[PDB]
Structures are given as C-alpha cells and as structure tokens.
Symmetry: C3
Subunit: 418 residues, 3 copies
C-alpha cells in the first residue's frame, strides 16, 4: 500500500504548470463512444481513472492510444457491456451507459460500487435516460439500459443539480429524435467543456454554462480535435498549498474564470491574488491565512471539491472559520485525520467549525478520498516533523505527477513501498 | 431570497391566536380527492403548501376556492397524474396517490425530491398500497400506481411508525373491498383528524388515536363540512417563544390535549402552565428556563417537530440539557447556526448535548428547514443585536402570518427584499 | 420494558465459560433448510434470535427441538414464505431465502425492517442470488425470489465485503449446477464454521477463511452433527469487562485464534494476556488500561462488533484513544449514553476521539443496540453509584445468561420489572 512520507515544515513556493481537468477528461472520454470518425483529445492528464476509462473504451471495441492526448477511434465498438473488472474501480464508467443507449440501443454498466463521500445514487441518470425513451432494468449488480430505435428528446427538469446526470442526459440527447431541454442543468465548466466537445463532433447544443441546456438530436457524430480545459481543483489545490504555507506561487496553464469563488475566498484569507489570461499568482507575503467562512454548493458557488483543502487552510489560519458542506454528506472524513495532527475542529451536522492553530504536528494519517488525500499531503508539508499519509493511491486519481510538482515548490515528499 | 432581520433582545409576551394544523390540513386536502359531493374544510391555515396542494387539486380537475376555509368540489377530477411543477415543492403530494388509486384505479405522483431532515423514503406508502392491491411502478421520477378494479382490504402490520404511510393506507382503504386493519398505526392527532374527516364524508373507520386502525370499505364517499384542529407545533413554538424570553403568553384556539408531552417538558424548564379547554398560558415569571432532557419519538411522546425549538430553549437555559432525536436522521442542521450566535452544543451521534448560555449574540444565519427557520427567528428575538435569517421562505410553509404574530408579542422583525 | 440496575464500582474478576457463537449459530440454523436428513447442531447459545429462528424453521415445516443443541429435521419443509411476525424481530431471517431458492425453486422473506447501526441493505444477497440464476422481485415489503429449475453456479466477485451476503451465496451455491466462485469473500470465523457445517452435510466447498471461496454444487445434502465455535465477541466482551475494571479473568471454551486483533489491542491497553488451546486469560495486575487506537474493518482486522466495548475501554483508560468505525455508519449511539455517565468523547465523522477519565459516574442510560447494551452494562459495573440501563432486551439477543455470568465475576446487577 504505497504511503507518502512528508517532512515539514516546508514552504511551498515556486511555480506549477496546471493539468487538464480530471473531471472534463473523464466525461469526454465516454462521450467519444458516440463518435463515428476518429477523435483526438488533447491535454488529458495521466490519472488512474483516465487509464481505467481507456481500458474500457477498448474493451468495448474502440481503438485507443495516448500520450499527451488520448486517441480514440470508436467506429467499431461492438461490445455494449462493461466488464465489472474495469468498472468497480471507477464511478465514472456510468457514463458509458448513455452513449451506448443513444447510439447502439443498449448498454450495460455495473452499478458503481464503493462509496466514500456519500451514498452517491445514480437515480438521476436512470431517470433521464428513461425520460428520453430508455428502458432500464437493474439486476445482478448491473444497470441494463435499452431502447428499440432512437431515443426521443424530452423536456427534462432536473430535480436536483447533478453534474453527472446532466452529462448523461446531455450526451444521450445528442443522438435523439428531436429536442431535449434540461432545466436546472448543472452549470460547471466541465459540463460546458464536454458540451463543446460534443459540438466539435457536430452535436447541436446550446445554453451550457446556463441552467437550461438545449440539445437537438442529430443522426451521427463525427470526429475531431478537442483540448481539455485546465483543472480548477488542481489549481485551487496548489493555491491553497501556498497560502497555508505562507508562500507564493504561479499557476501556469490556468483558467481564472473557473475559480472566481475560490479566489475571492483566498482574497479573504488574506492572499495577494493576481491573474492573467492563462495564469494565476498568489502571494501571501510571508503571512498566515485568516479564517474564512465557506458554504459549498454547485457552480458557480464554492466547489465541494475544494472543501477539504479549505478545511486545512482554516485549521492553520488566524481565527474561527465555519465550513458548511452541502453537496455531499460524508465529506468530513479528512477532519479526524487532521485532528491527529493537532487541529481544532468541532463538527456540528453539516458544518465543520474551525479553530485555527499556528502549527500542526507531523503525524500518521490516512487517506480516505481524493481531495482528502491531497489535503493530508499539503498538511504534512507544513506540519512539524513527519507525516505519513497511508493509502496514497487516492491521490493518483486526480493529481498527475504531484510529488514532482510539490517537490518543485520545495516540498519534501517521499513515496514508500508499503 | 427574502430574509428576516430581527433585533434583540426582546421579550415575547402577549397573546396569540393559534391556526389550523398545517399537518392536518395537508392530509385532508388530499383525502378530499375521494369525495364525491362538495367539501368544505374550515380553519385551513394559509401556508405555502396549502397553496401548492390547491393548485394540484385543480390541476386534476377539482373545483377549488378558499379563504378561511378551502372549498373543494372533486366530482369531476379527470387527470390522474400530478405535474412535476406542483409536486417538487412539496413532499405532501404523495398523498394524492392513494386517493387516485382507490377511487380511479390509477394515479401517478412524482417521487418527492429534495430532502432535508433525512432520506425520507416512501416505501411504506408503496408497500401498503401494494398490499391492498395496487401495482406500483417507479419510472421517470414517478410513482405510477394502478389497480384494475377495487382494492381489497388487507391486514397491514406497519413495520415502523409513519404518520404519512398510515394516511395513505387509511385513505386508500376507505374505498376498498372489505376490511383493512393497520397495526402499529401512527397515533398522532392529525391522523385522528384526518380519519374523522373521512368519517364525515362517510367512511367507516375506528380506532384512530390507537395503534390499530380499522377501516371497512364503502363504495362512495360524500361531502360535508370539517373544521381543522389547532396546530400543536405552532402552539409549541409560541410557548417556547415565551419561555426562552422569560415572558408569558396566552394561546388562544388551542387544543391542550395534543401537547401533553411538551407541556410537561416546559413544566420542567420551569414554566407556569395553565390550561383551559381551548387555551393554554405559560408564565415564566421573569425567570430563565432550566435545562431539560428530551428524546423524540412518535405521538404521544415528545414530537420531533418541536426538537429544534427545544434545542434553542436548552442552549439558553440553566444547565446541561441532552436532546436525542430519534425519528429523523438529519434534523440538527439548526445547531451550527445557533452556534454562530454563541451557543454551546456538542453533537454525539443522535444526541445534541446542550450547555445553556445566558445570552446569544445576534448573527447571520441560515434557514435549513421549517422548524429550524422558526427556531432561528425566535433565537434572534432574544439575541443581542441583529440577526438576519436567510431563506425565510421555509417559515412560510407552516406559520401563517408569523411576523405579525411575533410582532404582536413585542418582537422586532423585518422582512427584507433579497 | 426490562432494565438493568447496576451498582458500582465493582471489580470483574473470576472466570467465565464462553458460549457458542450467536453469529455462527444463526447462519447454520438457516443453512439447515437445505438438509435432507436430520441435523444436530451442538453448542447453540440461548439467544432471542435463536428462538425466533427456530420458530420460523418450524413455521416452514421443519421439525425442531432443542436444549444444549438444536435438533432440526427439515425433510418436510413445505412452506416457503416466512411470516412477517417472526421475521421483523430479526434481520437474520433473510438467510432463509437462499436455502429456499436453491432447494425449492422459490422463497419469500420480508425485507428486514428496523435499522439501528446503519441502513443495512441486502442488495448483495439479491445480487448474488440473481447472478446464480434467481429472479427476485420486491413487493409488499417482501423479497420474493424464485428460479425454475436449479441455480447455475457462477463466478461472483463481491463488490464489498459482506459476511451475510457471502453466506447467502455460499449456501445457495451448494445446490447449484456447477461451480461457484466467490471473490472477495468475507473471511470471518462464522463463515468458515458455516461452510464446515455445509461440508458435514456433504457440500463441496473450499477456500473459506480465504478471500475466495469455491463451491461445487451437489444434488442433495444430508444430515449430521456440528458443534458451534466459541463466540469471540462474547469473549472480547468479557476480556474488556476485566481490563476496564482492573481485574483478571479466565475465558473457558474459547478459541484464541479468532481474536488475534483484539488480543493485540488489549496487549496495548496494557493487559497481561495468556492463551492456551481453548482458553484465554487476561491480567491487568491492578492497573488501569492505556488508550489504544482502533480502526475497524473485516476479519481478520479489528471487529466492528467490539468497537462499542473498546469505546468504553478508551473512555476510562489513560490517554487519548481514537477509534474509527468503518464497517457500519451509525454505530456510535453508545457514545452520548456513555457521556451522560461522565465520559469525554468528540465525534468527528467516522471517528470517536476519546479522552480517558479515571472514573465514570453511575447514570441512567439507554440501550440502542446489542453491543451498545453490553457496553453500557459493563460501564455501570465500573461506574460510581447506580446505573440503570433501559431496554435491556437487546442484550438478550447475543449474551446468554449474562447477569449470571457477570455476577459470577462479582458484579452487582439486577433486572427490574419495567
Ligand atoms: C468524475 C466527476 O465528474 N466527478 C465530479 C462530479 O461527480 P458527480 O457527478 O457524482 O456529482 P453529482 O453532481 O452528480 O452529485 C451531486 C449530488 O447529487 C447526488 N446525486 C448525483 C447523481 C444522481 O443520480 N443522484 C444523486 O442523488 C450526489 O450523490 C450528490 O449528493 O461532480 C461532483 C460534484 O460537484 C464532484 O464533486 C466530482 O468530483 C470528484 C468526486 F467528487 O470525482 P469523483 O467522481 O472521481 O470522485 C472529485 O474529484 O473529488
Ligand atoms: C406534512 C406532514 O404530515 N408532515 C409531518 C409527517 O411527515 P412524515 O409523514 O413524512 O412522517 P413519517 O412519520 O412518515 O416519517 C417517519 C420516519 O419514517 C421514515 N419513513 C416514512 C415514510 C416511509 O414510507 N418510509 C419511511 O422510512 C421517515 O423518512 C422518518 O425517518 O410526520 C412527521 C413525523 O412525526 C413530521 O415530523 C412532518 O412534519 C413536517 C416535516 F417533518 O412537515 P413536512 O412534511 O412539511 O416537512 C414539519 O412540519 O416539520
Ligand atoms: C447475525 C450476523 O451475522 N450478524 C453479523 C454480520 O451481519 P451482516 O451480515 O449484516 O454484516 P455485513 O457484513 O453483511 O455488512 C457489512 C457492510 O455491508 C453493508 N451491506 C451488507 C449486506 C448487503 O447486502 N449490502 C450491504 O451494503 C452493511 O449494511 C455494512 O455497512 O456481520 C456484521 C459485520 O462484521 C456483524 O457486525 C453482525 O453482528 C451483529 C450486528 F452487527 O448481529 P446482528 O445482525 O444481530 O445485529 C452484532 O452481534 O453486533
């Protein structure tokens, strides 16, 4: 079980180049199941899940290779069932379903198994596919969908915001008969990005970014070349790495406009943030962050996927910060691991109350999830002494080359056998 | 987003007239779907959800108007599907289902969407309707029920106490073939009230209030005139408004016997309670409440729907109070909002441990649910300075005219734009 | 409602003879539904649930009697539906399902109702039965399974570790056509034991204890005589009874090898543990335990079913102990009840942080579950003064004769009317 062994204190300062979004990359690799001429996707990070996804794409019979870009030729997809052995490692394989139903009239994906940050149902995928025509059955740990003939576009009001369900309905609606409207669409950048990929392939979508997306179905999608947006949560992570460590950094290959709410928040912890077109810099000027108060919620508010990292920021800032998590209901499993390093947090229902201390002591902690694991590694950069983060594999799902990137900022990290 | 801006400290004292029960009114409006001569329901409060319910009743083709009473002529109901656009605002629209199945042989209600105080499944509705004959399917975010011919009464043991499931089976059983027995029936006053409405219409029900209700089916229900009981949780709320503020008040238009367990509890916080037939008074005599210990559970024990308000009472009483919530599993979202106003609570599993402070400071808080929102407004009446309760819309679902009623007791409240 | 009234402090020291495992006994009584010559099961404890199970076995038409052993003749089973009235008291009746499907081609068990320590779905039973052939439907609060003809063995990878699902698939696979492989099988001793019972009856199973069990189906199972292993959680409980009370004890009729991880942990709280072949002794030598740190997880790690008892140990040990529960998600309901007796615990997500105090004061507490209830009784043995444990019925489900066994160690316990 690889662990990280980190020694602090250390001061994260320097520059980092930012990778493609994990969470754009993943939807778009599955969306390519609809494409009927070859596809090049540039700026794909190298993450555990991209690698599992590419394996599945080729178990369904697409021709796939990569490097800085992934290349997918999906013309001869012939299997329509994903094997459990690729699918259990990643929740993201539920997005093969809609592509296979829209374009092949069936699909069978396992029900994603292993929660961590909540129950995480896919009932809003199933529902929307159904509303567009499909017949879903659930049996033997699988979601079997099928439709005879094409789907029929529908007017789909989504009950709650869901980035992923929005993706499934958006993708599946591109090969449907007619016009789909998704009200209360998730507004996130990866949803926009994804829709723009679809549109390169020749989909007819408008109003992504907005709360109401519109797709009129076509009969066939082509191919083409799409570059993936920069990863705003890897970005937010490296901006927190330097605020909590009283440093300063520049983020290269970034998109500032996908981060407005973190940047304000970091303005509020006391940070000196500047931005240009494809870069952001933060300067703490030697100072310690000030406690902020956060509520997560969907884009464009403060992203849940930065909550664990702002948790640590607050627990070494000046003051009391409260952070309410509202999007997911078991996303404080980093807290007690941070407490073993010294921190002072009370949880009360969905809020973690946070009393900033000046320094944390290095400890042996456990990764419970992706963003927890990054948090715990940043925490040990700054702690006193030695942190060992057990189960560092989780970090590998969303931070390409991170020991290298944090060690370019001065960090002292080391990956240990097991 | 309307907020309340409250200034304290202030002393809630005076009198208040009590409204009809939200939670009797709601079941009875849906029960009227069975009535085949006109219905007058008197003492219906003016609550968000009554207004949504009346809109739906008339989208199914009943003739509906109101004022102090709601008037429903339900003879020409012809739609049997509730539209999502009325149904997503209110969980209470699941009670159209049983009326439409019993009397029309189908019905289609959306699955209620948006939790707050727990997961809140309706599996005990579905189960009992099924046991009485129906065929339920779940698809496209809907609960489709149907039966060919009448339902057949059954012997239905309910697995856990559920006020709402009890309602669905009780209503649906009135047009069934034969005799239904519900064991472990919910005993609440609104269940009794509801059954008595049904009985006015000519149902044949006995043993409501008891843990075993019996209904023998008839073929047709008529019409008539029913007045709704007084709202014991609006009542409990105004009795807490005055205990925590060291006041005194009289509740007009009340029913003492639906509150025995709160009244004892308030006797235990130190209150001087008197009661007559349709009124209750509490006198704190200038004094501060004493901490009590509560476990919620179904009627006739301490009602969950007073737990948030007794939370605040304890967090400004003398002493440590523990309150265990056992009925719903995400009903401490008022706690951290009360903590931002100064309070000292530890949560530990289902209990909130409560260390009474003498005064709370006014703050900016958020409503997370109905009874949370009332709690937060009472808390700012008593706090020092200014509270702003964001999302005050929630209060509107269960407290008719409340800014007026609390401002008649001296409160300084003001509704702000957004 | 019987309660226990306990007076401390008192010092639990002596010897105890250990009973058969509750959680081996239960699976094996249901597994006997497959046996087609008479079965004797020796060393069956006398627990509430064994008594409910025997009642059901004979409601399906087996011939059943007991004493130190239970005797089951299951040749003329003719009902295949379990009645709700036996089934709602026990989650363990879901294990009739697989036996009835494998051997009779149908079965109908109610969906288990009443949670306490989590949501506790049986989706991994259903899934595996399905994968082996069955057709499951869910309606009227029942799980109806059926297959026309035999089941067909399959290669079943289990998504998460589940002791019970492993049992259902293991049992049902013995009368199947061919070879079943269960990957990620639960490794627990009761699973091993159960498989060895099956094997006595003539099943063909190998690799229990391992993460991959293999069963090739036969056509008929016989009868025979199996003795049940010793109960390692009753064992762990009595070893904690004496560590927290600074005593010493000997466990007769034990199996040390099913407890390696508790024994180490108790070595770490400072205990002097010795073991022989069918016995374990612990000596605290007069001293108070030292705080340990626990994570639960499946066998062979630290068992969840000892977590509540190690909670109390830590909250009267020297130091801070952290205990993370990872197996079940509502298994800290003992904590606030222990807090009313004086303890200092913070919960933070899945961990209870534990600050050992030297003494607890006697109080009035409530049992919320099996292992909670034992914990609370051990806590009042050691507390100052009087504890009353309300709802002591829960203890009766897994600790045969416990007031007698703890009173043989010096305890002062008394069962009170209600
Ligand atoms: C791959 C990917 O797009 N993941 C991101 C994506 O994942 P997801 O699609 O599940 O979010 P979603 O909006 O659908 O969930 C929102 C809320 O809706 C519920 N939900 C979601 C789908 C549904 O059918 N029903 C439903 O009830 C969730 O259980 C949650 O309570 O949106 C969320 C929320 O903003 C991120 O927080 C994820 O990022 C993470 C995990 F959150 O990635 P991952 O899936 O790998 O685990 C992350 O990087 O931290
Ligand atoms: C309209 C109305 O009758 N609402 C009241 C009514 O609502 P409800 O019928 O859902 O209560 P119910 O007894 O059925 O729930 C009891 C417990 O049973 C579970 N439950 C309920 C139904 C079911 O099919 N399955 C099931 O598992 C719940 O999820 C809960 O954990 O009974 C509860 C409990 O005593 C009150 O606490 C509600 O009052 C509130 C909310 F609680 O109103 P609302 O629905 O508007 O939100 C309130 O005023 O505070
Ligand atoms: C009878 C019996 O075998 N019970 C023991 C048995 O029970 P169970 O089979 O449900 O454990 P299981 O491994 O299947 O559950 C493990 C985890 O998996 C989930 N789970 C389980 C089954 C499933 O189909 N799906 C699923 O999601 C659970 O909800 C839990 O989160 O394994 C557990 C876990 O190690 C013990 O902790 C139980 O012991 C207790 C309760 F835990 O007995 P009981 O059932 O009487 O309540 C106990 O003595 O304390």
């Amino acid at each position: 079980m690889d662990k990280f062994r980190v020694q602090g204190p250390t001061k994260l300062q320097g520059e980092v180049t930012i990778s493609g979004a994990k969470n754009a990359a993943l939807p778009i690799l599955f969306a390519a199941l609809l494409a009927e001429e070859p596809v090049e996707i540039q700026n794909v990070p190298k993450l555990k899940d991209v690698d599992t996804s590419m394996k599945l794409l080729s178990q369904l019979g697409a021709k796939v290779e990569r490097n800085g870009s992934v290349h997918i030729d999906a013309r001869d997809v012939n299997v329509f069932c994903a094997p459990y052995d690729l699918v259990k490692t990643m929740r993201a394989s539920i997005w093969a379903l809609g592509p296979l139903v829209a374009r092949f009239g069936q699909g069978q994906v396992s029900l994603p198994g292993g929660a961590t940050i909540g129950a995480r149902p896919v009932d809003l995928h199933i529902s929307g596919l159904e509303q567009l025509g499909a017949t879903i059955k659930l049996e033997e740990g699988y979601v079997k969908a099928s439709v005879d003939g094409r789907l029929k576009g529908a007017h789909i009001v989504m009950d709650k915001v869901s980035v992923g369900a929005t993706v499934t309905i958006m993708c599946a609606a591109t090969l449907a008969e007619g016009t789909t409207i998704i009200e209360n669409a998730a507004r996130e950048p990866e949803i926009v990005d994804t829709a723009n990929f679809l549109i390169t392939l020749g989909a007819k979508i408008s109003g992504q970014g907005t709360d109401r997306i519109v797709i009129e179905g076509v009969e066939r999608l082509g191919g083409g070349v799409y570059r993936v947006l920069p990863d705003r949560i890897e970005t937010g992570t490296f901006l927190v790495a330097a605020a909590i460590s009283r440093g300063k950094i520049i983020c290269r290959n970034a998109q500032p406009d996908t981060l407005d709410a973190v940047l304000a928040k970091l303005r509020d912890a006391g940070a000196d943030i500047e931005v240009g077109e494809d870069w952001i810099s933060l300067d703490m000027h030697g100072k310690r962050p000030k406690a902020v108060n956060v509520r997560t919620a969907p884009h464009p508010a403060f992203p849940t996927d930065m909550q664990a990292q702002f948790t640590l920021l607050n627990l070494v800032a000046e003051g009391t910060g409260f952070i309410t998590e509202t999007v997911f209901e078991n996303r404080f499993m980093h807290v007690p691991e941070l407490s073993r390093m010294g921190a002072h947090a009370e949880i009360e229902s969905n809020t973690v109350i946070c009393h900033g201390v000046e320094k944390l002591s290095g400890a042996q902690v456990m990764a419970t999830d992706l963003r927890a694991s990054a948090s715990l590694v940043l925490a040990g950069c700054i702690a006193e002494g030695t942190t060992v983060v057990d189960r560092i594999y989780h970090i590998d799902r969303g931070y390409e080359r991170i020991e290298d990137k944090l060690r370019a900022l001065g960090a002292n990290i080391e990956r240990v056998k097991g």
